[PDB]
Scaffold this active site. Structure first.
Site, PDB file in Angstrom:
ATOM      1  N   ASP A 180       0.870  -1.207   0.000  1.00  0.00           N
ATOM      2  CA  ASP A 180       0.000   0.000   0.000  1.00  0.00           C
ATOM      3  C   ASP A 180       0.896   1.243   0.000  1.00  0.00           C
ATOM      4  O   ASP A 180       0.539   2.210  -0.667  1.00  0.00           O
ATOM      5  CB  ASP A 180      -0.937   0.013   1.213  1.00  0.00           C
ATOM      6  CG  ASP A 180      -2.301  -0.608   0.963  1.00  0.00           C
ATOM      7  OD1 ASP A 180      -2.403  -1.546   0.128  1.00  0.00           O
ATOM      8  OD2 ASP A 180      -3.264  -0.114   1.570  1.00  0.00           O
ATOM      9  N   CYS A 214      -1.851   0.430 -13.433  1.00  0.00           N
ATOM     10  CA  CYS A 214      -1.956   0.443 -11.950  1.00  0.00           C
ATOM     11  C   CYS A 214      -3.201   1.317 -11.733  1.00  0.00           C
ATOM     12  O   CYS A 214      -4.185   1.160 -12.481  1.00  0.00           O
ATOM     13  CB  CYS A 214      -0.610   0.861 -11.381  1.00  0.00           C
ATOM     14  SG  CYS A 214       0.110   2.337 -12.150  1.00  0.00           S
ATOM     15  N   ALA A 216      -3.128   5.030 -11.744  1.00  0.00           N
ATOM     16  CA  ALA A 216      -2.945   6.145 -12.714  1.00  0.00           C
ATOM     17  C   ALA A 216      -2.295   5.663 -14.023  1.00  0.00           C
ATOM     18  O   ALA A 216      -2.381   6.392 -15.041  1.00  0.00           O
ATOM     19  CB  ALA A 216      -2.158   7.261 -12.057  1.00  0.00           C
ATOM     20  N   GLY A 217      -1.618   4.511 -14.036  1.00  0.00           N
ATOM     21  CA  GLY A 217      -0.867   4.101 -15.249  1.00  0.00           C
ATOM     22  C   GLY A 217       0.475   4.811 -15.438  1.00  0.00           C
ATOM     23  O   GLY A 217       0.894   4.932 -16.600  1.00  0.00           O
ATOM     24  N   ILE A 218       1.139   5.267 -14.373  1.00  0.00           N
ATOM     25  CA  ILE A 218       2.409   6.028 -14.512  1.00  0.00           C
ATOM     26  C   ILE A 218       3.455   5.517 -13.533  1.00  0.00           C
ATOM     27  O   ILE A 218       4.643   5.573 -13.903  1.00  0.00           O
ATOM     28  CB  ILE A 218       2.190   7.570 -14.450  1.00  0.00           C
ATOM     29  CG1 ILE A 218       1.586   8.061 -13.129  1.00  0.00           C
ATOM     30  CG2 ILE A 218       1.353   8.040 -15.632  1.00  0.00           C
ATOM     31  CD1 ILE A 218       1.601   9.581 -12.974  1.00  0.00           C
ATOM     32  N   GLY A 219       3.084   5.087 -12.315  1.00  0.00           N
ATOM     33  CA  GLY A 219       4.058   4.785 -11.258  1.00  0.00           C
ATOM     34  C   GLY A 219       4.578   3.365 -11.338  1.00  0.00           C
ATOM     35  O   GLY A 219       5.679   3.130 -11.928  1.00  0.00           O
ATOM     36  N   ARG A 220       3.849   2.421 -10.758  1.00  0.00           N
ATOM     37  CA  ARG A 220       4.203   0.983 -10.825  1.00  0.00           C
ATOM     38  C   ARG A 220       4.290   0.544 -12.295  1.00  0.00           C
ATOM     39  O   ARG A 220       5.177  -0.230 -12.621  1.00  0.00           O
ATOM     40  CB  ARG A 220       3.153   0.178 -10.078  1.00  0.00           C
ATOM     41  CG  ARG A 220       3.090   0.521  -8.600  1.00  0.00           C
ATOM     42  CD  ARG A 220       1.991  -0.259  -7.927  1.00  0.00           C
ATOM     43  NE  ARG A 220       1.614   0.344  -6.677  1.00  0.00           N
ATOM     44  CZ  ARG A 220       0.560  -0.022  -5.915  1.00  0.00           C
ATOM     45  NH1 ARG A 220      -0.272  -0.975  -6.307  1.00  0.00           N
ATOM     46  NH2 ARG A 220       0.351   0.580  -4.746  1.00  0.00           N
ATOM     47  N   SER A 221       3.400   1.053 -13.134  1.00  0.00           N
ATOM     48  CA  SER A 221       3.319   0.707 -14.584  1.00  0.00           C
ATOM     49  C   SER A 221       4.617   1.141 -15.266  1.00  0.00           C
ATOM     50  O   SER A 221       5.177   0.407 -16.090  1.00  0.00           O
ATOM     51  CB  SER A 221       2.128   1.373 -15.242  1.00  0.00           C
ATOM     52  OG  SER A 221       0.877   0.877 -14.791  1.00  0.00           O
ATOM     53  N   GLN A 261       6.861   7.757 -10.191  1.00  0.00           N
ATOM     54  CA  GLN A 261       6.129   8.805  -9.426  1.00  0.00           C
ATOM     55  C   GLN A 261       6.980   9.323  -8.258  1.00  0.00           C
ATOM     56  O   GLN A 261       6.746  10.471  -7.840  1.00  0.00           O
ATOM     57  CB  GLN A 261       4.794   8.263  -8.904  1.00  0.00           C
ATOM     58  CG  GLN A 261       3.612   8.614  -9.792  1.00  0.00           C
ATOM     59  CD  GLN A 261       2.301   8.087  -9.258  1.00  0.00           C
ATOM     60  OE1 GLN A 261       2.129   6.887  -9.047  1.00  0.00           O
ATOM     61  NE2 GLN A 261       1.349   8.985  -9.055  1.00  0.00           N
TER      62      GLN A 261
END
Ligand SMILES: CO[C@H]1CC[C@@H]2C[C@H]1[C@@H](OC)CN2S(C)(=O)=O
Length: 281
Positions: A180, A214, A216-221, A261
């Site tokens: 988390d 994920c 937003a589609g920017i961090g983990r992705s 991110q």
């Protein structure tokens, strides 16, 4: 070499500093389609928009918009679609995009609920006998099989175009153990997950681009695509240590804003590439 650059940044604690130079140097392209008022309810986050030049277009005449970007890595010969976790009203658009782009795999890096809030709509069926119909896009989705492991789940799905009665098999790779807060302590299970996606053929040029998301589609992705592309470039090049993570990240950021991110995600990406390089040399 990145391992020595890693120890330097780590020993000096300069991660926030490196991260800010990346933020500063990152491309800024127009995202006019994303900001049209008729698209406000197609975006999960008002500050995360696809660039117009790289945005995926739906083949529906009404409104072609989805929060999704094509990331084309020319030297690595890899493409990825990075998208947001679908909304209740965009689940049908998500599956239309999977259909239209001929994707073989969907990679999901979040849980539906994290920190007590919903990060994503439940966009796949939970039981074999309870299929989902998306009336807006004329698609049917059936769960065929589900293999639950400790750190990820793989699902076989059948997607049917109700209009033409064609069917395809889609693989859903769900990384279920990203914490988390922060990043995993070790990149071992993330690397195992990335090798499982590769083994499936989902990242292969025979198929349309993999869909990665994920919330937003920017961090983990971003971490997923950055590790895959860096490891592939280290296999292809005469000199593996010519691979500069920061340059690859900046080249990716021409296609979608905000990839990676936090300074934590950047540090984790270096660790994943450094560790994966051992299993590749
Ligand atoms: C966010 O967790 C980590 C990321 C990496 C480190 C330590 C810590 C950050 O402090 C909030 C600062 N950076 S640092 C010293 O390199 O600037």
């Amino acid at each position: 070499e990145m391992e020595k650059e890693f120890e330097q940044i780590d020993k000096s604690g300069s991660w926030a500093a490196i991260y800010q130079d990346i933020r500063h140097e990152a491309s800024d392209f127009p995202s006019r389609v994303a900001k049209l008022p008729k698209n406000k309810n197609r975006n999960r986050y008002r500050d995360v928009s696809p660039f117009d030049h790289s945005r995926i277009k739906l083949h529906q005449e009404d409104n072609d918009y989805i929060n999704a970007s094509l990331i084309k890595m020319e030297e690595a010969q890899r493409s990825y679609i990075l998208t947001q976790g679908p909304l209740p009203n965009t689940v049908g658009h998500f599956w239309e995009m999977v259909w239209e782009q001929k994707s073989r795999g969907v990679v999901m890096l979040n849980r539906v609920m994290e920190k007590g809030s919903l990060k994503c709509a439940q966009y796949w069926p939970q039981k074999e006998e309870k299929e989902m119909i998306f009336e807006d896009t004329n698609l049917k989705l059936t769960l065929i099989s589900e293999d639950i492991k400790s750190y990820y789940t793989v699902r076989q799905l059948e997607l049917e175009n109700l209009t033409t009665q064609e069917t395809r098999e889609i693989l859903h790779f769900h990384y279920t153990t990203w914490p988390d807060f922060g990043v995993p302590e070790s990149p071992a299970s993330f690397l195992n997950f990335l090798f499982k996606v590769r083994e499936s053929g989902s990242l292969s040029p025979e198929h349309g681009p993999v869909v990665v998301h994920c919330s937003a589609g920017i961090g983990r992705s971003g971490t997923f695509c950055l590790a895959d592309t860096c490891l592939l470039l280290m296999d292809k090049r005469k000199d593996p240590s010519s691979v500069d993570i920061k340059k690859v990240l900046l080249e990716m950021r021409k296609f979608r804003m905000g990839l990676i991110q936090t300074a934590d995600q950047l540090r984790f990406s270096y660790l994943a590439v450094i560790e994966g390089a051992k299993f590749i040399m």
